[PDB]
Amino acid sequence: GKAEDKEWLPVTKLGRLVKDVKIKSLEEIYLFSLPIKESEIIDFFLGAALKDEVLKIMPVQKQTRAAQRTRFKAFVAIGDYNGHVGLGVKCSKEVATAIRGAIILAKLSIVPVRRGYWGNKIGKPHTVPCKVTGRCGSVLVHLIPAPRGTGIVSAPVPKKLLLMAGIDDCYTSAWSCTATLGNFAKATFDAISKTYSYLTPDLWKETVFTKSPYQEFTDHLVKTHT
């Protein structure tokens, strides 16, 4: 019937440089640590590879004068299988609104993961590059490198984010109240996010500052429209 979709008129200086192809891929949106605020930028460079996996639907409820008003908290992980992942949380009055709304957050929070080698470099890194630790609430999670072919060794929950981040082999440990799925998943996501901010003897070469896209595309943004 009707066709010729037009939606997503951007609302940001980044939405303009991304909708028009003037920006290549996330690796320059990350290089300047810019904040993504639209749920479509990720759907642009990805989408052909992203998967959504609901982890839990938890009914919480507050006490009210006459009654106990209950809402649902839906934990949704997301990620391709080549080095990106994200995990979002949203609470709402009905179970569909929460699941629809959490996917937008989990997209809006995708981070890059850095996979390294265990013993010798035979192409295509496979496990974490070093020993990483991450906390939330009382939960602590520790991720350790492992030799090729061992497969992830963890509880069922972290063996859903570690797989969707693209890490094949990994050894793990956890401490305190792992039962609470909230803290157990934010702890894992944190220990993954820490992978690119661990300085290693290979990242010692002095850095060469290029120019940010807010400077290189200052013309296209001046002209065209505010």
Partner 1 sequence: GALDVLQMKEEDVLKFLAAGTHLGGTNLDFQMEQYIYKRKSDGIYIINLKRTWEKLLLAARAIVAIENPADVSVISSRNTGQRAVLKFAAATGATPIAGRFTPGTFTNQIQAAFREPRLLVVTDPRADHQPLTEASYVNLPTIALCNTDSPLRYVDIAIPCNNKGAHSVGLMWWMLAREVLRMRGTISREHPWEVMPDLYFYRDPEE
Partner 2 sequence: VRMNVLADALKSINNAEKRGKRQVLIRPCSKVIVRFLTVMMKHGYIGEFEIIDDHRAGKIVVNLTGRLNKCGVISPRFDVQLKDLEKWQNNLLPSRQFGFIVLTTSAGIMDHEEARRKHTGGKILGFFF
Partner 3 sequence: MQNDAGEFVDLYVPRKCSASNRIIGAKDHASIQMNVAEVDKVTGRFNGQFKTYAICGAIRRMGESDDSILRLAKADGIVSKNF
37 binds partner 1 (CB under 8 A): yes
x/- map, 78-117, partner 3, by CB under 8 A = -----x---------------------------xxxx-xx
Contacts of partner 2 in 102-121 (CB under 8 A): 116-119
Binding partner of residue 13 among partner 3, partner 2, partner 1, none, CB cut-off 5 to 8 Å per kind? partner 1
The span of 25-33, 44-52, 72-80, 193-201 binding partner 2 (CB under 8 A) equals 193-201
Contacts of Mg ion in 144-183 (CB under 5 A): 179
5 binds partner 3 (CB under 8 A): no
156 binds partner 1 (CB under 8 A): no
Contacts of partner 3 in 144-173 (CB under 8 A): none
209 binds partner 2 (CB under 8 A): no
222 binds partner 3 (CB under 8 A): no
| DSSP per-residue codes, the chain | -----------SHHHHHHHSTTS--HHHHTTTTPPP--TTHHHHH-SSS-EEEEEEEEEEEEE-SSSEEEEEEEEEEEE-SSSEEEEEEEEESSHHHHHHHHHHHHHHT-EE---B-SSS--SS--B-SS-EEEEETTEEEEEE---TT---BS-TTHHHHHHHHT----EEEEES-TTSHHHHHHHHHHHHHGGGGS--TTTTSPP-----HHHHTHHHHHSS--
Residues found near Mg ion in the complex (CB under 5 A): 179
Residues of this chain that bind partner 1 (CB under 8 A): 11-13, 32-35, 37-38, 214-215, 218-219, 221-222
